Amino acid sequence: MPEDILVDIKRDYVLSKLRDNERIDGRGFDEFRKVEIIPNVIEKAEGSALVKLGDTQVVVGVKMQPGEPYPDTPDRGVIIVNAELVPDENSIELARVVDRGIRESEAVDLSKLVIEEGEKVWIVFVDIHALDDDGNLLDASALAAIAALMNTKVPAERFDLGEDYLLPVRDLPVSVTSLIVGNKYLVDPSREEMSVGDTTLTITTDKDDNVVAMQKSGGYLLDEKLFDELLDVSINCARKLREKFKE
Amino acid sequence: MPEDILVDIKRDYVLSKLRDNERIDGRGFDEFRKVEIIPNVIEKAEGSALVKLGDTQVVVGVKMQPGEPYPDTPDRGVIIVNAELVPDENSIELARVVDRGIRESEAVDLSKLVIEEGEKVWIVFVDIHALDDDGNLLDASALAAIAALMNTKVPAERFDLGEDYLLPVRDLPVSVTSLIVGNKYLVDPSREEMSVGDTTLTITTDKDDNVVAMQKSGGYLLDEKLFDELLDVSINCARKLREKFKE
Amino acid sequence: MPEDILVDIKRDYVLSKLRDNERIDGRGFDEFRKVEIIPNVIEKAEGSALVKLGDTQVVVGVKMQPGEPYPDTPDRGVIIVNAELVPDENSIELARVVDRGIRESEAVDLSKLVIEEGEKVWIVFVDIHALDDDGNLLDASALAAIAALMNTKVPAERFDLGEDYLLPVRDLPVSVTSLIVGNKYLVDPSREEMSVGDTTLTITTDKDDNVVAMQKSGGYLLDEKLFDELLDVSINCARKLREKFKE
Amino acid sequence: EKLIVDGLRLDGRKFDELRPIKIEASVLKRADGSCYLEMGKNKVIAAVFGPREVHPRHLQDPSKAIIRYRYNMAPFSVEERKRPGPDRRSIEISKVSKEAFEAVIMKELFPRSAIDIFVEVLQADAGSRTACLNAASVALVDAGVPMKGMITSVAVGKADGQLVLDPMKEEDNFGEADMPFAFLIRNGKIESIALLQMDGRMTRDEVKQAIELAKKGALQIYEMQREAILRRYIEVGEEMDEITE
Amino acid sequence: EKLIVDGLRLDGRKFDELRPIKIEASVLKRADGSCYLEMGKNKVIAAVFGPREVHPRHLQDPSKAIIRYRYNMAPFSVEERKRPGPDRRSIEISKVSKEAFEAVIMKELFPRSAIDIFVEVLQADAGSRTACLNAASVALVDAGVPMKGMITSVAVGKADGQLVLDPMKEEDNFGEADMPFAFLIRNGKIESIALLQMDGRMTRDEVKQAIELAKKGALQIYEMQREAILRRYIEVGEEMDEITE
Amino acid sequence: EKLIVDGLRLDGRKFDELRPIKIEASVLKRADGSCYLEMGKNKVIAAVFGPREVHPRHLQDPSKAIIRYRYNMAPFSVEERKRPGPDRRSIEISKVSKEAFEAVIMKELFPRSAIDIFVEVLQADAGSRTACLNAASVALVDAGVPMKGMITSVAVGKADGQLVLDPMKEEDNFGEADMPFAFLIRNGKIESIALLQMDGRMTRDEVKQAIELAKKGALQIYEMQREAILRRYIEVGEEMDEITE
Amino acid sequence: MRFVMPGDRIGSAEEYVKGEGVYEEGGELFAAVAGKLIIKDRVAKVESISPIPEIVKGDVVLGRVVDLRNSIALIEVSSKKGENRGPSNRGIGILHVSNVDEGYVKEISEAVGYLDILKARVIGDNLRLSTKEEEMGVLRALCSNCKTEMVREGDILKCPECGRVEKRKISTDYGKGEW
Amino acid sequence: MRFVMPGDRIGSAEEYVKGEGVYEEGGELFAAVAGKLIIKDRVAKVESISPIPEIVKGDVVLGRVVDLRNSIALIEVSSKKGENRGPSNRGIGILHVSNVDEGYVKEISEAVGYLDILKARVIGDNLRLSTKEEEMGVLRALCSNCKTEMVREGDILKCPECGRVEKRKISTDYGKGEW
Amino acid sequence: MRFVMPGDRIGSAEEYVKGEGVYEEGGELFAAVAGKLIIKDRVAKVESISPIPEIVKGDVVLGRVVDLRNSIALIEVSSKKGENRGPSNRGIGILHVSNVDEGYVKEISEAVGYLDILKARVIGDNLRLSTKEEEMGVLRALCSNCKTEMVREGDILKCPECGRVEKRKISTDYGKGEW
Ligand SMILES: [Zn+2]
Ligand SMILES: [Zn+2]
Ligand SMILES: [Zn+2]
């Protein structure tokens, strides 16, 4: 409540500029801030990645160990995603989205992580750790999680399943989160821009540009007109971010 | 504190009519309100029932699945009873009472729910879900719970045990809760009569009119004379109630 | 806050006597209160002991039951220490220290508690229960814990393994906790003295006068010279307490 | 197995046909507003506790009422008895469900107060999330709390490559996508989206076609919603002439 | 297996014999009142923290003191090392035990205060719940909290068709019934029922015949409680004449 | 398996040699103070949130700031994925850590305030507790919160009978003793002990000698801390000259 | 049919004037609630099928004194007579001495009390309570010695247990369990 | 034997008058606490084996200054001299400048400091305190600057650390840890 | 090199006057913060690498009105223009109608508003605020009828949706998002 005073004035500013068709830092309404992906940042981890989205920082680590195959899928691997935003409800929504995008795009062939039909199956733990929250930890974590899985090494030797091999990854889930303000949208909102409210839309695309997951959040009404425009711009934005994994 | 005002006034009313030996609604001191029992309200469940007691509403679901019994009793089925009164203290007591009536009256031959002696056994979950609290959710949940078990179908097939059959029920536990105000007792108290205080006595009877369980809850002293009297009444009310299971 | 008024004054009194080189009961700064160790106070326990340190009273019961050894240390029995003080951050610490002394001195050979290669192993539960807190529940608890273990009977003939035997206790861990005030130290502080603040040093020693565990707790700076002296003093205090176990 | 055989889903419904719905207002005596709703095998019950005082003073708001929404499944609502209490899924559904009404309720009329929505699924099937929202919107009107309009909700699935309205358990477990929607109906017409969520794989085109399929279903559901409140209007009406009679 | 062989029970007691009892008041130093009690193998201790200030202000009652009672079993009090932490059974025992005392403590004498009662069982057997209430009642007198009278409790069991006073573990685990009571005791006589609970299967007569067998043992227990406070009375008395001596 | 072979440890260092250390201040934007730290294979990140208002009123000390310290391990920081959330070991570490700063931080200058220290270990090895302290201390200076001086921490272990500085994972697990230390440093000198703990088996003589090895190590680490802050001083300096440039 | 659902368009904000159960947005009036639409004298209002009470100058309310200050008395207004629903503007209401019995009484204790359930009237935007009519007044009081319920005995309120007779502005409905 | 257990009948509610440790019900007097039954001039009371102290006019009390409002000092009374048991009527008491010192003193911050531990004597119901006498006053204070416990020196309190100097109604037991 | 770390000895408290970023102990001056050591006129101080602002006399502040008494206006001070780091001496300051615009306005409720973001100036201590300057005043006023933020139009704050207008001391940076 005492923090709100500074934020509210920051809100007036972001709106003062929105009326004049601009953002605080000069970006375009569909422009992400500089993205930096750094894999293998946690050696003891089977896979890992640090992603920087503007000043926003997040690190994802992956751990693999055998064990529990779900009763309904005793022949399908397992992927668990968790996040820590050092509230709970948010940290939970963040983990679920990242997970949905990985799950629905089938980025990781869960059938290949089988070891013993319904007895032992590889279990992939994806843990998201936020370091610096400067806005849109969601996209950063999504970029970091897929980047981490792509740079993951199955710990076969350490156990008894033979030679170690890279985790078979077949898709590249990416998500664009936009801050909706009235009938205007702002892709990749910064912490400052969020001072307007927590009204956002998140679209997740796969290799082929198929929408794999969508999530609208906040106490706001989403104009269907804007949603259509944002649906297009978003698939585009995800594609351009996807070529950041190429080089 | 703000709701206590209307409850205290309502209390002045209840006591006034009690002085003239009259209940708010004219009912007789040993008469339950309209009792309605409807089985199979929830389908996907192996057993279910809903009970209306005056304006009081309760639904009970019975689930079943093979499981491992208590190491203490290697040869017997398992019955767990829960309740959600959408505080926790009262919700545990209500579940335990209903529970005790079912267990002590031996309404369910736990020896018939054994699969692989010492290994697998039928675990009967009985969840009580209060829909509308207008007083005496207990008797309502006891009625509902027993009704629900009598209309249970053991899902033998679903688990490859073959041919479904009814859950053999061999007794009909029925609890009668009364509110105690001084030396006078009011059977099947309404939520409006409970404005007097949460001082009650509960007696559960079985098929043969024996006491299978008792419970006095609340900050009050029970006169022994009153008890003996109410002990008979209760056993009688049980019979008048236990007949609504015949037709 | 309200209980603080009384304690702040008591604190002024104790500090007044310190300024005159005195403790409120006349004890020496390296003198413990009278110690009383009474084993077998809980017969339904494989082992147990009541300890009276001045007016401080503590009971420790020891329960043993077969279980699975940790994955990392098969061929190794298990000892789990837990404390109950009727805050939690203090209860955990007190248990961890007591536990640390038993474990680092190797008072019980865990290798001898193996039942089956890496499947069945004896699990030792040491639970500390504070009865009266008049200061230094820690030293008291360490005393009772090691005493209880010394009077423990492995319930072999109850799980059908073999014959009953006394738990092989190979050492005698004793911890000496002191209240550090400024540049002075007070061995075995009483609840009265503790009003000065919660700044202590605890040194646990073994049978050969080797330091087995140490722990300074509280927000304060421990002077190196004071520590060096408290070291010797504590080793010696432990030797004396250790003797109460002989006779 | 096979989801669509000869234009008919595994229950006889057409790609654009809702499951049998039922709606009843004022079903709970102890509640400012309530509603029993059914959507296919889904049996749901909403309860609303009107603009009251939020007791733990810290969660109070000096300018507007806070809205709380609790989506809870009974342990007997699913196929395999589910442990009672908040799930991560439940927490999620409660967060988004509360967000759909936060935009609709005129919470600014009741500062420092709280309007709590409680929805309980007694029997679950696919779509309970949308059933509860429909059920809650009715209960909110029954409770008479000011709103900009109604909240209607439906999910659009996708089976065997074909978009379907109001998906059932099997089309939700074996389909290629599921997309719950909730719209604000104002003046008998879809105006905006209150709740949007999707999981699966759909093309940019299919998403747009799915919006359409859903709005058709919402207007259909909204009608059932006005009907249920109409009956209520009659009850409180012929109820006044009751004491006078 | 039989529970009654020739009038004698497994431990040699007669159907109407309390197990050996031991009661000592003022046993703890940092506590306003306290008591160590022993019923058969039951080893229990109670502590009362006299009229004190209840911290969370929302629990504070403007007209009368609030009573809290906590039954808790030591991890080492049962044959199988129980895990610390409130049990459903424990929560239940505490609630019913608190009620037994709310009915006697003169709470209207201390508005906004709290009288906390902690009772710990160091060694459990059947009826620990009874030992605790007895212990507690002694502790309360020891702490000097105004009461209508004393609370005395005992359980009646049923073994091989026969009622038995103060049943043991074996009887409780293989008998046909278990029924704990507690009475308010004014003017050296049993006046009313403070705590009543039954499990098993009993006839209308047996139940009534159980109260008699319970009040008989209660009076005996009560005389023991009274001797424990009388000794304390000597101790506070010769302790005063000590300062002057 | 021998830990010391020819005066050298499994990684090649001598008994009195620190593992390679890397320290960077101001690495977080949304924190009053911070520092990234690498101690051997320990990758630790510290964050400090300058004197801010403590929210739960009951934790507000009218005369001084309150210190809170949270040591936490990332699920991926260990060999076997660790369940996130506090455990007994972390709460403990958090407590002694809180206490090490309670004596150095000048809390009387910020009444009714809170100085919250958060330390996360991204990759752990033996000594993480030590690494976090050094990180936290740098973070606190980066945040400009007043202190009597620096806090530098190192642990001493015992391997094959010899005391070794800054033990590694194999040494802590297979050695004979682990002893984490932390001192207050003023005027470039070790003034007092801010944190002391030990587990294992050491002779009185080895304990005193251990204090001596840790001091030699801590001074070396202190220099590295001073350096990290020196650079931070040079970067904010050439920053103030930047805006003017 | 006058029936109206929330969201239904009522007309332009120009011709009609926003009233109860109606709101404006984009220059248009819609119903905020379900119920009968009444457009009388330029004013459009909707009779909610479940109105939310509002304590207004002139209403009969049920309250409880939370604290006394030898003149100004704080009464916790909980509900409005007529409707079971709890009002939206519930809160603390102040009852001054001048408005107690249109008589001459000092202090306040001779009429009010503490924790005693009262029944006054509303007069003043600040829930300013006033008790003049004989229908109003304390509806249920408790003794200070035994805290026991006080029974009405003629023109005074006596206690059964202790016997201490207490006097104060009694409400003809006192002890009736009604108001 | 004069020993009585709670619940023991002392006599009819007509015979004697209800005193300390005794309660009435059904027209009969009983003992509520264990102790010696004493009967002085038809008044039956019981001396409890564990008396719960009550702060009354004349008692010496120990308290803390929780609020310094101009010419007013709100003291957090917690203990009654002579008994260790927490008193039944604990709460906030009041100290007026007029009672701070029998002498002449302006302001209150000139004698009673915020958070100070006081030793006062009750002179009026509702925990009305008086510091008049020399045996009464502040027993411990903190430097307003460094917050260090101030050491008494002469008739003024001094901080050994920052050397600040404050003046106040110092009890002659300041720093003795006794009151 | 003027750089110092906390703990570094600066000199005896005899040779220099303890200034900001320095503490005394055993008659020795030490640095409490890291930064540049400056000795101006015997006064030794350290320029912190991360200064913690102290809202002193004469600096521009920013706050939200917590409650408007008839004459005194209670403001919740939060920041001190020129630094993002929340200052140390934050809390609630006081604004008297006498200090609004050098003009003569009676009510304070119409000058400032409840929950209005204000841009004041410090007058002396305890956060004594003033707003009689153009640069100072309200920065964001919320409508009382529709609760929405109001836009500026001339010298009035005209609400965009409800149309209601309010008049209060407005800052020249109103609605700018700057201060
Ligand atoms: Zn009375
Ligand atoms: Zn000072
Ligand atoms: Zn407006």
From Swiss-Prot, chains A, B, C:
One Pfam family named in its UniProt record: RNase_PH_C
NCBIfam families xref list:
PRK04282.1-1 (NF003282)
Task: Name the HAMAP family on file.
Answer: Exosome_Rrp42 (MF_00622)
The protein's UniProt keywords, in alphabetical order, are: Cytoplasm, Exosome
Q: What is this protein called?
A: Exosome complex component Rrp42
Name the predominant localization. Answer: cytoplasm
Native source organism of the sequence: Archaeoglobus fulgidus (strain ATCC 49558 / DSM 4304 / JCM 9628 / NBRC 100126 / VC-16)
Q: Where does the protein end up? A: Cytoplasm
> GO terms for CC?
cytoplasmic exosome (RNase complex)
Function, as annotated, reads: Non-catalytic component of the exosome, which is a complex involved in RNA degradation. Contributes to the structuring of the Rrp41 active site.
Q: What family is this protein classified in?
A: Belongs to the RNase PH family. Rrp42 subfamily.
The lineage's top-level taxon is: Archaea
Subunit comment:
Component of the archaeal exosome complex. Forms a hexameric ring-like arrangement composed of 3 Rrp41-Rrp42 heterodimers. The hexameric ring associates with a trimer of Rrp4 and/or Csl4 subunits.
Any transmembrane segments, and where?
Answer: none
Q: Which GO terms describe its biological process?
A: rRNA catabolic process
Alphabetically, the GO molecular function entries are: mRNA 3'-UTR AU-rich region binding
Q: Which Gene3D superfamilies does the UniProt record give?
A: GHMP Kinase, N-terminal domain
UniProtKB/Swiss-Prot annotation, chains D, E, F:
- State the Gene3D superfamilies in the record: GHMP Kinase, N-terminal domain
Which lineage ranks, top first, belong to the organism behind this chain?
Archaea, Methanobacteriati, Methanobacteriota, Archaeoglobi, Archaeoglobales
Q: Which organism is it from?
A: Archaeoglobus fulgidus (strain ATCC 49558 / DSM 4304 / JCM 9628 / NBRC 100126 / VC-16)
* Superkingdom to which the source organism belongs: Archaea
Task: List the InterPro entries hit by this protein, alphabetically.
Answer: ExoRNase_PH_dom1, ExoRNase_PH_dom2, ExoRNase_PH_dom2_sf, PNPase/RNase_PH_dom_sf, Ribosomal_Su5_D2-typ_SF, RNase_PH, Rrp41
- PANTHER family assigned: EXOSOME COMPLEX COMPONENT, EXOSOME COMPLEX COMPONENT RRP41
Output this protein's name.
Answer: Exosome complex component Rrp41
Complex formation: Component of the archaeal exosome complex. Forms a hexameric ring-like arrangement composed of 3 Rrp41-Rrp42 heterodimers. The hexameric ring associates with a trimer of Rrp4 and/or Csl4 subunits.
The record lists the effect of residue 57 to E as: Reduces RNA degradation more than 90%. Abolishes RNA binding by the Rrp41-Rrp42 ring
Swiss-Prot record, chains G, H, I:
The answer on whether this UniProt entry bears the keyword Ion transport reads: no
Instruction: Please give the superkingdom of this protein's source.
Output: Archaea
GO terms, biological process: RNA catabolic process; RNA processing
**Keywords for this protein:** Cytoplasm, Exosome, Metal-binding, Zinc
Q: Spell out the InterPro entries in the cross-references.
A: Csl4, EXOSC1_C, Exosome_cplx_N_dom, Exosome_Csl4_arc, NA-bd_OB-fold, S1_domain
Please give the chief subcellular localization of this protein: cytoplasm
Q: Where in the cell is it found?
A: Cytoplasm
Keyword S-adenosyl-L-methionine part of the UniProt annotation:
no
What is a single cellular component term in the Gene Ontology annotation?
A: cytoplasm
Q: Where does the S1 motif domain start and stop, copy by copy?
A: 58-137
Amino acids binding Zn(2+): 143, 146, 159, 162
SMART domains, alphabetically? S1 (SM00316)
Q: Name one Pfam family in it.
A: ECR1_N
Q: Which GO terms describe its molecular function?
A: RNA binding; zinc ion binding
Which HAMAP family would you find in this protein's record?
Answer: Exosome_Csl4
Its assembly, as annotated, is:
Component of the archaeal exosome complex. Forms a trimer of Rrp4 and/or Csl4 subunits. The trimer associates with a hexameric ring-like arrangement composed of 3 Rrp41-Rrp42 heterodimers. Interacts with DnaG.
Query: What protein family is recorded?
Result: Belongs to the CSL4 family.
Function, as annotated, reads: Non-catalytic component of the exosome, which is a complex involved in RNA degradation. Increases the RNA binding and the efficiency of RNA degradation. Helpful for the interaction of the exosome with A-poor RNAs.
Q: What else is known?
A: The zinc ion has probably a structural role.
Q: What is known of its domains?
A: Contains an N-terminal domain that mediates interactions with the hexameric ring, a central S1 domain and a C-terminal zinc-ribbon domain.
Q: What is this protein called?
A: Exosome complex component Csl4
Q: Which gene encodes it?
A: csl4
